[PDB]
Paper text:
To extend the structural coverage of proteins with uncharacterized biological function, we targeted Pfam protein family Pfam06938 (DUF1285), for which we determined the structures of two representative members. The first structural representatives of the DUF1285 family revealed a novel fold consisting of repeated motifs. The structures revealed a conserved core with domain duplication and a superficial similarity of the C-terminal domain to pleckstrin homology-like folds. The conservation of the domain interface indicates a potential binding site that is likely to involve a nucleotide-based ligand, with genome-context and gene-fusion analyses additionally supporting a role for this family in signal transduction, possibly during oxidative stress.
The SPO0140 gene of Silicibacter pomeroyi DSS-­3, a marine α-proteobacterium, encodes a protein with a molecular weight of 21.2 kDa (residues 1–193) and a calculated iso­electric point of 5.7. The crystal structure of SPO0140 was determined to 2.5 Å resolution using the MAD method. The final model included two protomers (residues 10–192 for chain A, residues 10–193 for chain B), one glycerol molecule and 186 water molecules in the asymmetric unit. SPO0140 is an α/β protein comprising two domains. The N-­terminal domain (residues 10–93) consists of a β-meander–α-­helix–β-meander core (residues 24–92), with the two β-meanders hydrogen bonding along the first and sixth strands to form a twisted mixed six-stranded β-sheet. Two N-terminal helices (H1 and H2) pack against the sheet and complete this domain. SPO0140 crystallized with two monomers (A and B) in the asymmetric unit. The largest packing interface buries ∼810 Å2 of solvent-accessible surface per monomer and involves mainly helix H1, strand β1 and the H3–β4 loop from the N-terminal domain and helix H4 and strands β14–β15 from the C-terminal domain. However, packing analysis using PISA suggests that this would not be a stable dimerization interface. The results of analytical size-exclusion chromatography (anSEC) support the assignment of a monomer as the quaternary state in solution for SPO0140.
Residue numbers in the entry: 10 to 192
The structure:
Amino acid sequence: SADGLLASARAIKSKGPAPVHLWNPPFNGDIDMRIARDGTWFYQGTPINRPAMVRLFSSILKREEDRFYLVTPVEKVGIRVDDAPFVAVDVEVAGQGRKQVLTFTTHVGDSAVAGEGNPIRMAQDPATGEPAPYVHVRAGLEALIDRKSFYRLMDLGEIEDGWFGLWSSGSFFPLMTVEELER
């Protein structure tokens, strides 16, 4: 129907994240694309080991309600996202204590400064029931924070009014109860 993976990638050009909320093209169907929980894109069930192309398609990700699309000015297609569209693979701290700022980098190279504009959210693992936290990157597209980055964040956490969590950019993001941290 009737332009494929590589052809579609050749039609896109991006210097960066596209202003997809300017665009409301008609829906052309769902494609067999799935962003796995670990950030891997699958096409027709086969992974794409191709970070350039993953960055290119990621530039045109758009969230509507709870679903995800790839959107250009002329076309919109639905994709499947298992969990978050991105994985946060790095976190950088600056400053100290309650004044600290956390800058995250995602697996496609985007940067998100944690704070009110890009909040950190606590969720639990569907599977484990263990804490799985996210950070907002843009326009409702969130990054799941990976193990390596999570464990470094534990060491930069703080307690305020019953909750263990993270200060970034002057705002406090609860992650779990004190009770929970103590377990």
